[PDB]
Curated annotation (Swiss-Prot):
<feature type="binding site">
    <location>
        <position position="4"/>
    </location>
    <ligand>
        <name>S-adenosyl-L-methionine</name>
    </ligand>
</feature>
<dbReference type="GO" id="GO:0031167">
    <property type="term" value="P:rRNA methylation"/>
</dbReference>
<comment type="function">
    <text>Specifically dimethylates two adjacent adenosines in the loop of a conserved hairpin near the 3'-end of 16S rRNA in the 30S particle. May play a critical role in biogenesis of 30S subunits.</text>
</comment>
<keyword id="KW-0698">rRNA processing</keyword>
<dbReference type="InterPro" id="IPR001737">
    <property type="entry name" value="KsgA/Erm"/>
</dbReference>
<dbReference type="GO" id="GO:0005737">
    <property type="term" value="C:cytoplasm"/>
</dbReference>
<feature type="binding site">
    <location>
        <position position="75"/>
    </location>
    <ligand>
        <name>S-adenosyl-L-methionine</name>
    </ligand>
</feature>
<dbReference type="InterPro" id="IPR020598">
    <property type="entry name" value="rRNA_Ade_methylase_Trfase_N"/>
</dbReference>
<dbReference type="InterPro" id="IPR011530">
    <property type="entry name" value="rRNA_adenine_dimethylase"/>
</dbReference>
<dbReference type="InterPro" id="IPR020596">
    <property type="entry name" value="rRNA_Ade_Mease_Trfase_CS"/>
</dbReference>
<feature type="binding site">
    <location>
        <position position="29"/>
    </location>
    <ligand>
        <name>S-adenosyl-L-methionine</name>
    </ligand>
</feature>
<dbReference type="InterPro" id="IPR023165">
    <property type="entry name" value="rRNA_Ade_diMease-like_C"/>
</dbReference>
<feature type="binding site">
    <location>
        <position position="92"/>
    </location>
    <ligand>
        <name>S-adenosyl-L-methionine</name>
    </ligand>
</feature>
<dbReference type="Pfam" id="PF00398">
    <property type="entry name" value="RrnaAD"/>
</dbReference>
<keyword id="KW-0963">Cytoplasm</keyword>
<feature type="binding site">
    <location>
        <position position="50"/>
    </location>
    <ligand>
        <name>S-adenosyl-L-methionine</name>
    </ligand>
</feature>
<keyword id="KW-0808">Transferase</keyword>
Length: 263
């Protein structure tokens, strides 16, 4: 485990979280408890989910100085987050859980999260439409939250030093900006189209038709009919998947959902 040791990066994360004594913070991963201490100083209460009980002496040290820290010994991917009353999340994430934890957290909901990821993952999360790093992850996150990289974090900020840079990412859920009609269909639609990111949406959907439970012939005919509904749809489905904006992918998928349900 590469512990975050550089207090300057702890400070940047904590600052980005805009904490007050009315906030309740979830942290994932205890590490040395440096970040934990700063959270406890500034927030009402902090929950820490930590899988490795050999880190208990760090927990015990903290609990001597702070009365507002609760340690949950367990797997963050398994814990029922619905049962905890946090409004913010601040963590140097265990990188291996980056994707599922992000969506688990977003599903549960929060006012704001400030999370450290490996740099390449963060770049993908925030990537602009039509760029090399833009993909399913980018749209999956940006359709649900405003995201931005707060700071790049060098290997030297950790001990032992990792092989790659990390990045602090601020995530602010934003449900009403894009308004997903049906989350499960949206998820299936994203999966299908990003299996062929350099093809037109139309051709991607045909190739991946089985991801939406249609055979290739069915899907071809569906899209013929769909394209005839209006000129905007025609223009969207003929563009390359990775070139459509998040707004356009959300609206296209919403329209397609409504189309299929009507049919
Ligand atoms: N799924 C998990 N839930 C809670 N804590 C974890 C989980 N996975 C790893 N950790 C802890 O987070 C620390 C950072 O993860 P890692 O740097 O990927 O080894 C590790 O030392 C573990 O103690």
């Amino acid at each position: 485990q590469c512990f975050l040791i550089d207090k300057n990066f702890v400070n940047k994360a904590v600052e980005s979280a805009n904490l007050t004594k009315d906030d309740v913070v979830l942290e994932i991963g205890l590490g040395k408890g440096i970040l934990t201490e700063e959270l406890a100083k500034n927030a009402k209460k902090v929950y820490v989910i930590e899988i490795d009980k050999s880190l208990e002496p760090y927990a015990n040290k903290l609990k001597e100085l702070y009365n507002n820290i609760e340690i949950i010994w367990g797997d963050a991917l398994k814990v029922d987050l619905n049962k905890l009353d946090f409004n913010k999340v601040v963590a140097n994430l265990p990188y291996q859980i980056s994707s599922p934890i992000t969506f688990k957290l977003i599903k549960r909901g929060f006012d704001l999260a400030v999370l450290m990821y490996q740099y390449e993952f963060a770049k993908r999360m925030v990537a602009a439409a039509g760029t090399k790093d833009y993909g399913r992850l980018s749209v999956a996150v940006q359709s649900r939250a405003d995201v931005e990289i707060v700071a790049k974090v060098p290997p030297s900020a950790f001990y032992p030093k990792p092989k790659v840079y990390s990045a602090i990412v601020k995530i602010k859920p934003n449900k009403g900006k894009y308004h997903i009609e049906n989350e499960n269909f949206f998820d299936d639609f994203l999966r299908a189209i990003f299996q062929h990111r350099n093809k037109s949406v139309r051709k991607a959907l045909i190739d991946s038709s089985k991801e939406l439970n249609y055979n290739k012939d069915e899907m071809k005919k569906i899209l013929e009919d769909f394209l005839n509904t209006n000129s905007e749809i025609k223009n969207l489905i003929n563009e390359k998947v990775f070139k459509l904006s998040v707004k356009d992918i959300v609206n296209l998928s919403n329209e397609f959902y409504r189309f299929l349900q009507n049919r």
